[PDB]
Design a protein around this ligand. Structure first.
Ligand SMILES: CCc1ccc(NC(=O)P(=O)(O)O)cc1
Length: 106
């Protein structure tokens, strides 16, 4: 049950995710998972990033879920659960702006 996860913000808008993530106290990789506003059955992994060029900013990645079971951002790298996906991306940046580090405070 992803709804039991503390990083699962459920039905919140993209703008709301950005308001929460754009807090100066948030280090790179602060994140949350929410429902996509318009992509049915897909979730959105919203992540904070920071650099001298752009300063504090937010990226959104789409998490696809197959009825076949797996969860993924890229079909080449799938997981048996959303929790396993979050755990993988907390260790690897791969194509993301930063590895997942801290659950976004409300
Ligand atoms: C109109 C085309 C359209 C396609 C996808 C999105 N996705 C969302 O905004 P999300 O970032 O909550 O997933 C928005 C517009």
């Amino acid at each position: 049950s992803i709804q039991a996860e503390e990083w699962y913000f459920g039905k919140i808008t993209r703008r709301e995710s950005e308001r929460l993530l754009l807090n100066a106290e948030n280090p790179r990789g602060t994140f949350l998972v929410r429902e996509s506003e318009t992509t049915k059955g897909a979730y959105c992994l919203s992540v904070s990033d920071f650099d001298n060029a752009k300063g504090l900013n937010v990226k959104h990645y789409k998490i696809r879920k197959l009825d076949s079971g797996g969860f993924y951002i890229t079909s080449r790298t799938q997981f048996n659960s959303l929790q396993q996906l979050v755990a993988y991306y907390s260790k690897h940046a791969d194509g993301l702006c930063h590895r997942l580090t801290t659950v976004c405070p409300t």
